[PDB]
Structure 1
């Protein structure tokens, strides 16, 4: 009858899940950038 109930939880649930994907991606990217950059210094220092 009321379509309103089932619509408005579905599209709040969809946002919760997308927002889970967001902070998972925005983290793995970072961790690799940090590790890349640590070792760059370890090459910069090693030769010097």
Structure 2
């Protein structure tokens, strides 16, 4: 046991999932813009 190594590595992963979600929600914000523009 060396606590930090595995108890921090498990965090790094979460922030890669997190980063996916962010990069995702923008695509929705992209289609929302586009949804307005093309009709307007």
TM-score normalized by the length of structure 1? 0.68
Number of residue equivalences: 39
Kindly indicate which of the two structures has a greater share of residues assigned to helix.
Answer: 1
Unaligned ranges ≥5, structure 1: 40-48
Moved over 3 A (4+): none
Unaligned ranges ≥5, structure 2: none
| Aligned residues: CA RMSD | 1.0
Larger radius of gyration between Structure 1 and Structure 2: 1
